[PDB]
Symmetry: none
Subunit: 149 residues, 2 copies
């Protein structure tokens, strides 16, 4: 419906002067998500993770995220946020070892030993839980990888 | 034999019209590497580091990287990426204090106290961990410094 009309207003407002979303503007919008959802355990989205997101999502290499690049990422993020909440069945405000398999499958990813050992590990705490920002960050990198073998 | 013919296609394609690889083009191919390997922690390759890398590798002063210059740098990068992964034995997606010395040795370098403390202060975080782009940038600069003398 007009939710597409809603998204265009979001993009234009967020992108500003240059019409593209930089890592800073991305950081702004992601921390707005954490602001509106205090039920999410998170230490916020740092500039480093947001620069990494842009680097792997900026496929036309403009250095920032254009309309189509931001729309793709944004819908993914909103979709993953829904998954994050849906799969946190122990109400920990995080996604743990018993929740992750289902969550990643719902996000459209198939896991393997490499992924668990080389990716998931670095994004989770000592009990295997990943907070909201790590969860989203891990998925952006995983999506960037899947879309590009 | 094969990887050679395709490296050549890689170079010509990346160099574009001026037939040499700029700092911007280097940044794009390097960000493409982290896009494909989520097992590498990174905040992407900034233009600033990619310009200093080009500056110390541009042996013939054209301001950019020609075939031979880019070939040398690129082969080093791939070798260093294999080292990064091999030596990250705690699977942090980064190279830390107990991993650095070994990794640098494999890269062909033996550092003294002065350099080691500088390296850690300039390229590693508060835990003594350096990400992928910092590791690569550090090695390019170290490589170039030692070559000179």
């Amino acid at each position: 419906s007009e939710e597409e009309r809603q998204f265009r207003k979001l993009f234009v407002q967020l992108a500003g002067d240059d019409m593209e979303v930089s890592a800073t503007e991305l950081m702004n919008i992601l921390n707005k998500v954490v602001t509106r959802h205090p039920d999410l355990k998170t230490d916020g989205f740092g500039i480093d993770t947001c620069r990494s997101m842009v680097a792997v999502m900026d496929s036309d290499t403009t250095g920032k995220l254009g309309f189509e690049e931001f729309k793709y990422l944004w819908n993914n993020i909103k979709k993953w946020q829904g998954i994050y909440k849906r799969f946190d069945t122990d109400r920990s405000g995080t996604i743990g070892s018993n929740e992750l398999p289902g969550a990643f499958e719902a996000a459209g990813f198939h896991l393997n030993q490499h992924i668990y050992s080389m990716i998931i590990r670095r994004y989770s705490d000592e009990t295997g839980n990943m907070d909201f920002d790590n969860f989203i960050s891990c998925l952006v990198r995983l999506d960037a990888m899947f879309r590009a073998f």
